[PDB]
Design a protein around this ligand. Structure first.
Ligand SMILES: [Mg+2]
Ligand SMILES: [Mg+2]
Ligand SMILES: [Mg+2]
Ligand SMILES: [Mg+2]
Ligand SMILES: [Mg+2]
Ligand SMILES: [Mg+2]
Ligand SMILES: [Mg+2]
Ligand SMILES: [Mg+2]
Ligand SMILES: [Mg+2]
Ligand SMILES: [Mg+2]
Ligand SMILES: [Mg+2]
Ligand SMILES: [Mg+2]
Ligand SMILES: [Mg+2]
Ligand SMILES: [Mg+2]
Ligand SMILES: [Mg+2]
Ligand SMILES: [Mg+2]
Lengths: 190, 175, 139, 201, 252, 109
RNA sequence: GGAUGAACCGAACGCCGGGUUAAGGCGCCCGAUGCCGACGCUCAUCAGACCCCAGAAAAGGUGUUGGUUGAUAUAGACAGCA
RNA sequence: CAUAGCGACGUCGCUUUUUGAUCCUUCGAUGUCGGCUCUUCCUAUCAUUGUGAAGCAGAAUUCACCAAGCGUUGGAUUGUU
RNA sequence: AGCUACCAUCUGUGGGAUUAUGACUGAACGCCUCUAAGUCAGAAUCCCGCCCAGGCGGAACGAUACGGCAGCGCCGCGGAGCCUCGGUUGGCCUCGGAUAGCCGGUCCCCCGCCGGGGUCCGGUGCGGAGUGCCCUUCGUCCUGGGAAACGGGGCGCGGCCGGAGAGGCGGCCGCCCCCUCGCCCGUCACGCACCGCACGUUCGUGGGGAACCUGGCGCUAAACCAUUCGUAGACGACCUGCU
């Protein structure tokens, strides 16, 4: 079955504007600018009004697999709006049984050094994606804060940190040591 | 039975009169066939299945094409059929949109061949009926029930790919 | 992105088939591939027609779907589609192609002479403009 | 025809373009295919790479120096495809093969000339937009071709020079339009003839 | 059927053309990767294997049995009289590889260097580069040479210097000098061309190319052994004494 | 003063896959890529013009190196503008991929 | 004609010209679809591709496409959260 | 505690490293076992690299995946395999 | 001395795409989800590097034959011709590219008077169109009107610039010598008008080879054998030396 039309509309807040260059969406808000192209998906993007800034994604004559992409594009654009308005902040906790995990944040939060993971002498150097800043939280004793505008970049950096501290050749149900993403939220809480 | 653009035939037959009944009953069927020869053959097949008749023991008193009474009007056709799959026999109800009943049945034969690999000898069309747009059950048919239907032609593929075969300009797909 | 839509009353130009080179109005839509199609003033009786041989124009007529020839013809004649189409650049490009194709040998010779002289005059003017523009000298 | 047919390999499907080229060279025509690194192959890149790795595996066990010669440049890959569609073991096939020239990038003989396009071999019209395709340049590079970077650099230089040439041509055409506007009293006598016979709408 | 016991293969297939080398000198075949950040320098040199001896030295390897201990180590002496620079080659990068763009030779090419160009120096008229060296004097040839240098500067990617050894300083019978393209690394093409042009007709000693206690690569042709059998060539197992037609063979 | 003949290519002989009928040839006329366009060229004279070593007499001129095998187009071939031609002598196989002139001589227009 | 092949499919044979077919085919090898062919199905990191025939089963899939039967739902379904 | 690891009763396959069955090729001859030597190939992986699972606390072990790059030995007895 | 031994000694290497697998974002399926679109990490595997060989594959550069008539190179399309190989029968001198989008033109900002952005105006079954463009061959003679007349021609000289991926090409100046002709529409007659007929019409002063004449400008060399060496070696081949 080919559905004639599948459309979905995303509302744009007043403090943020969106510019379309074909299938390239540029979202400029208070916190920065997020630019992302969707040229791998054959949809039609349109900006509706000069009043409330609706963005409509249309798919014509699409089967099920390419109808699945409309809400994917809409969710990506909503994440871009969220990133440029409130930003993305991932809080990670380092858990350990015996050896405390010492984390050192190098220049401008772009590099993370893990020192004593499971008591080994190896030093884990994990480089954050550009635009993502890591920091050591002042509210919790073992907590990393990863802040950025791009959700995929922030979460990829968090995944790199989590996967760097991987227990090997042991029962992972018992050796629970490592750095894990505790929560995902925004900056400025607005 | 092969195909083409099928035609509807009203085929009326009966048994030959015998010294048991001087006026045997007349039986009528709608046969969708490429031509009247195939129509008569299929009529004998079906009446042999239903009644106890044979081509040799009976005769065909009429075989005439049924012209569509409104070929200028789009309409919805429901087709009840049965067919033999590779591992059984199944009853199906399908829906199509067309101007002519014979065209709808041809659409059905092509669609059964495409979706179920069902050859025309496996398919028995047992009912064809024009249905109202509110009685339709298939979403692919129901989605065209819009008084304000509107869609573009998004990605128009070049079909004149060999006139010219060599050119300087790359084709445009947006129109 | 899209500006021309398949819809009721949309006027389409027939690219190929038995009715090539004619204007028609879309009366109804059948199964994603065909349309009930009517040219009442361009001599195309009502029939099914594939979308592959249609090229949509910018003219849209206002009649209800599956109306009769009377109403389609009145919609066509009021705000005459024929004169507007002939005025469009599309139709006059078609006409130019046709009259270029039907040009004879004497016509080809005359066109060759006229184009020769026209191109020579234009080329002389282009050289004059180039020499006029070449005299730029400013620090 | 009597001149050389120059085909831009960018955006063209491998087998489609190779079949067209093989028929052309068998018909006694000189064919030059340029920018063979821009040729596309239908199917995703991993699958096409697996195909070429199987081709790499096919070698003569006794003496690989005699075995199948696996050419790594995109031009040589396309050349081998055309040879596969040609009867290359006869004199007619060898002459047809000699009538074909293939290049990576666009070399100086042909970068100053117009390049044809084969629509019947173009990816945009021969392939559904949702399907995946592979680049011959990337495939060649990751299977052993050594000159992807230098070809890219030279192609960028050629594109800069072509941009300069195109700006000059646009300026000339603007000036020609201005000239046609300037002289029209002495031109309308022939413009009417051209319009009457269908040239120059 | 499978062989009864596993055994590793005799010899390496990475050297299969087990043939006499087509060259006597030994060519580099890979120069070090060039980075402009480094200063301008040469990447290679030519020496002559004089002989071997051994030395005594104290080792500074912590955690070893020979830490702070004396060891005797075999060493090879390679006599390296200074090279003489007589030319500059430019190369340009093409989608077919590096190709030679332009070669410029210095004036006053040495006699031993000129001997390399002749198979029979005794019967020769010694005419090599005689007309070429005349273009270093007249204004036309000088302009042509400057155009060649500018073309190398603006088109070539890597440049190399032609350098030859000095036979007259060696105790050998041979008077024919050895020529070699040595790559210049570490800078822009203009800088390395200027450096090479200043080094034209000059002597480069080995201490300007190599330094103390660094690890280098040695390229050369091994000692010839003539036509050899499988037992000496591939070190296969000798067949038993009872073998009829010969035991220094590969059986299957 | 002008070419006055249509260019064609000697594509090959009439043939199956594994049988070849050399008595008739297949010609590809330039610009003719459909069967319905071949009607103009039916019956037209066609010539295979080549050069050789010895001089031969030229009608209305001095002897030169030029030789001709004359023929004519008989019928259309395929759907893509191929035509069949019969020549006075069967065309040499070295002419495959070479020029044939379609001379316009038996004009019906 | 089936690439190839004693037996398959077509058809049986004097030497030829023209026309037309069979079985089988018509991207290129290689004659013929260089039709603006029709409708769908299918993405395979071992795809598939034509009698004999030259390789596969039981069992599975929330891949996708049709179809059958039944059920719930503005007296508010289903899924989520409590 | 069916399915960590196993799998009765049944049932579907694959392989040609067993032994059969057959007798199509070879009887104007294809030298018939084993060992030695030597090369290459397969994967249905013993080890090693990277992983998933456990009735994986560690250690050891077991099951499974990508995987044949590399290795898989010295001997007493026996012609032996 | 030479050869030679884990029976002595020395040396043995870097990336890329990724598999399994673990993940990110994220629908399908208002939740979830490593997957559908899009992303990340990822290995004794794979490919390449390093290393070995070097194509009926190329490049740059050197020297290029006499002291006597003796060979050769360039310049002249210089002449007169031979032998042989045949193809062909106007040219296009170039944006990058996208395809659920393109192309052109123009005002304000930034960067060297040109480009890049934001406006605005057009075109889009591509007409600033390869279904296109350019050139267009009968030749001359009287003879007028238009286009031009700041114009075209020079195998005419000298200079300059651009082009290196295989530049083998293209463009611009200064001097000189020509015609006012060549482009369109007309006037005016003529040319073998060879008496119906084919291979006509171009590239073309084509490619290649020997040779004669005619001038100018320039060159005077190597390779191989023999000998020698022994870093080499069955023999060839190889490394060498020789007022
Ligand atoms: Mg353990
Ligand atoms: Mg083994
Ligand atoms: Mg014995
Ligand atoms: Mg046969
Ligand atoms: Mg077969
Ligand atoms: Mg016959
Ligand atoms: Mg076939
Ligand atoms: Mg064909
Ligand atoms: Mg139990
Ligand atoms: Mg024997
Ligand atoms: Mg034997
Ligand atoms: Mg396995
Ligand atoms: Mg040893
Ligand atoms: Mg979510
Ligand atoms: Mg994965
Ligand atoms: Mg990665």
């Amino acid at each position: 079955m080919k559905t004639i039309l599948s459309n979905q509309t995303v509302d744009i807040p007043e403090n943020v504007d969106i510019t379309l260059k074909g299938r390239t969406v540029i979202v400029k808000g208070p916190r920065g600018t997020l630019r992302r192209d969707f040229n791998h998906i054959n949809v039609e993007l349109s900006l509706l009004g000069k009043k409330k800034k609706r963005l409509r994604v249309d798919k014509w004559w699409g089967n099920r697999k390419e109808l699945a992409t409309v809400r994917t594009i809409c969710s990506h654009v909503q994440n871009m709006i969220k990133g440029v308005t409130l930003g993305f902040r991932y809080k990670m906790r380092s858990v350990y049984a015996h050896f405390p995990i010492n984390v050192v944040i190098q220049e401008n939060g772009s590099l993370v050094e893990i020192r004593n993971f499971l008591g080994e002498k190896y030093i884990r150097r994990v480089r954050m994606r550009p635009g993502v800043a890591c920091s050591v939280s002042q509210a919790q004793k073992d907590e990393l804060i990863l802040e950025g505008n791009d959700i995929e970049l922030v979460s990829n950096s968090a995944a790199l940190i989590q996967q760097a501290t991987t227990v090997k050749n042991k029962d992972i149900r018992k050796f629970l040591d490592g750095i894990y993403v505790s929560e995902k939220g925004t900056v400025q809480q607005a | 039975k092969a195909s083409g653009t099928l035609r509807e035939y009203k085929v009326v037959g009966r048994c030959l009169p015998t010294p048991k009944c001087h006026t045997p009953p007349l039986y009528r069927m709608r046969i969708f066939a490429p031509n009247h020869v195939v129509a008569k053959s299929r009529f004998w097949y079906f009446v042999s299945q239903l009644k106890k008749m044979k081509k040799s023991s009976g005769e065909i008193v009429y075989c005439g094409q049924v012209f569509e009474k409104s070929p200028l009007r789009v309409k919805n056709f429901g087709i009840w059929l049965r067919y033999d799959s590779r591992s059984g026999t199944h009853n199906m109800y399908r829906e199509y949109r067309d101007l002519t009943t014979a065209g709808a049945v041809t659409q059905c034969y092509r669609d059964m061949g495409a979706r179920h690999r069902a050859r025309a000898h496996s398919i028995q069309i047992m009912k064809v009926e024009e249905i109202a747009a509110s009685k339709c059950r298939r979403p692919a048919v129901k989605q065209f029930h819009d008084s304000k239907i509107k869609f573009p032609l998004p990605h128009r593929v070049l079909r004149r790919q060999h006139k010219p075969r060599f050119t300087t300009k790359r084709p445009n797909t947006f129109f | 992105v899209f500006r021309r839509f398949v819809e009721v009353g949309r006027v389409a130009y027939v690219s190929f088939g038995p009715h090539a080179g004619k204007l028609v109005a879309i009366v109804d839509v059948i199964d994603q591939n065909r349309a009930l199609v009517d040219g009442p003033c361009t001599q195309v009786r009502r029939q099914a027609m594939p979308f592959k041989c249609m090229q949509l124009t910018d003219f849209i007529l206002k009649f209800p779907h599956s109306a009769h020839q009377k109403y389609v013809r009145q919609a066509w004649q009021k705000a005459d589609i024929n004169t507007k189409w002939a005025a469009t650049r599309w139709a006059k490009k078609i006409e130019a192609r046709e009259r270029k194709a039907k040009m004879t040998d004497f016509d080809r010779f005359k066109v060759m002479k006229a184009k020769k002289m026209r191109n020579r005059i234009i080329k002389n003017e282009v050289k004059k403009l180039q020499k006029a523009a070449l005299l730029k000298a400013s620090p | 025809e009597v001149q050389v047919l120059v085909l831009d390999g960018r955006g063209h499907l491998l087998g489609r373009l190779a079949a067209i080229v093989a028929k052309q060279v068998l018909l006694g025509r000189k064919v030059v295919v340029v920018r063979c690194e821009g040729i596309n192959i239908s199917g995703n890149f991993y699958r096409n790479k697996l195909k070429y790795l199987a081709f790499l595996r096919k070698r003569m066990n006794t003496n690989p120096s005699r075995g199948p010669y696996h050419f790594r440049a995109p031009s040589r890959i396309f050349w081998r495809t055309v040879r596969g569609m040609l009867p290359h073991k006869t004199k007619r096939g060898q002459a047809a093969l000699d009538r074909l020239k293939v290049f990576d990038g666009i070399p100086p003989p042909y970068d100053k000339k117009k390049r044809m396009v084969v629509p019947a071999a173009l990816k945009v019209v021969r392939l559904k937009p949702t399907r995946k395709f592979a680049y011959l340049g990337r495939l060649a590079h990751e299977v052993g071709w050594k000159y992807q970077a230098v070809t890219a650099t030279l192609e960028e230089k050629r594109k800069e020079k072509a941009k300069i040439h195109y700006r000059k041509k646009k300026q000339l055409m603007r000036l020609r339009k201005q000239a046609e506007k300037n002289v029209e009293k002495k031109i309308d006598k022939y413009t009417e003839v051209l319009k009457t016979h269908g040239l120059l709408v | 059927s499978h062989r009864k016991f596993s055994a590793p293969r005799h010899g390496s297939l990475g050297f299969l053309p087990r043939k006499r080398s087509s060259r006597h000198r030994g060519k580099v075949k890979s120069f070090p990767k060039d980075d402009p950040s480094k200063p301008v320098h040469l990447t290679a040199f030519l020496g002559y294997k004089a002989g071997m001896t051994h030395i005594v030295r104290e080792v500074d390897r912590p955690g070893s049995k020979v830490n702070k201990k004396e060891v005797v180590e075999a060493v090879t002496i390679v006599e390296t009289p200074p090279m003489v620079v007589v030319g500059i080659v430019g190369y340009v990068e093409t989608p077919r590889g590096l190709r030679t763009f332009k070669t410029v030779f210095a004036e006053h090419i040495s006699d031993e260097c000129k001997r390399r160009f002749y198979k029979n120096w005794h019967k020769s008229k010694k005419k090599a580069f005689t007309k070429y060296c005349k273009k270093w004097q007249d204004e036309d040839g000088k302009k042509q040479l400057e155009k060649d240098f500018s073309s190398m500067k603006k088109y070539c990617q890597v440049i190399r210097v032609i350098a030859h050894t000095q036979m007259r300083l060696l105790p050998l019978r041979q008077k024919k000098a050895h020529l070699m393209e040595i790559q210049v690394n570490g800078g822009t093409v203009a800088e390395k061309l200027d450096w090479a042009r200043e080094r034209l007709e000059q002597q480069v000693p080995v201490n300007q190319v190599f330094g103390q206690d660094e690890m280098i690569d040695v390229i050369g042709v091994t000692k010839g052994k003539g036509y050899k059998g499988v037992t000496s060539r591939w070190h296969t197992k000798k067949l038993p004494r009872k073998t009829h037609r010969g035991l220094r063979k590969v059986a299957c | 003063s002008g070419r006055l003949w249509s260019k064609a290519i000697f594509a090959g002989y009439k043939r199956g896959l594994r049988n070849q009928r050399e008595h008739t040839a297949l010609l590809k006329i330039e610009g003719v890529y459909a069967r319905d366009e071949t009607e103009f060229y039916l019956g037209k004279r066609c010539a295979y013009v080549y050069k050789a070593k010895n001089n031969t007499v030229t009608p209305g001129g001095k002897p030169n190196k030029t030789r001709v095998i004359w023929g004519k187009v008989t019928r259309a071939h395929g759907n893509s503008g191929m035509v069949r031609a019969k020549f006075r002598s069967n065309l040499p196989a070295k002419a495959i991929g070479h020029r044939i002139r379609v001379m316009l001589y038996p004009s019906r227009i």
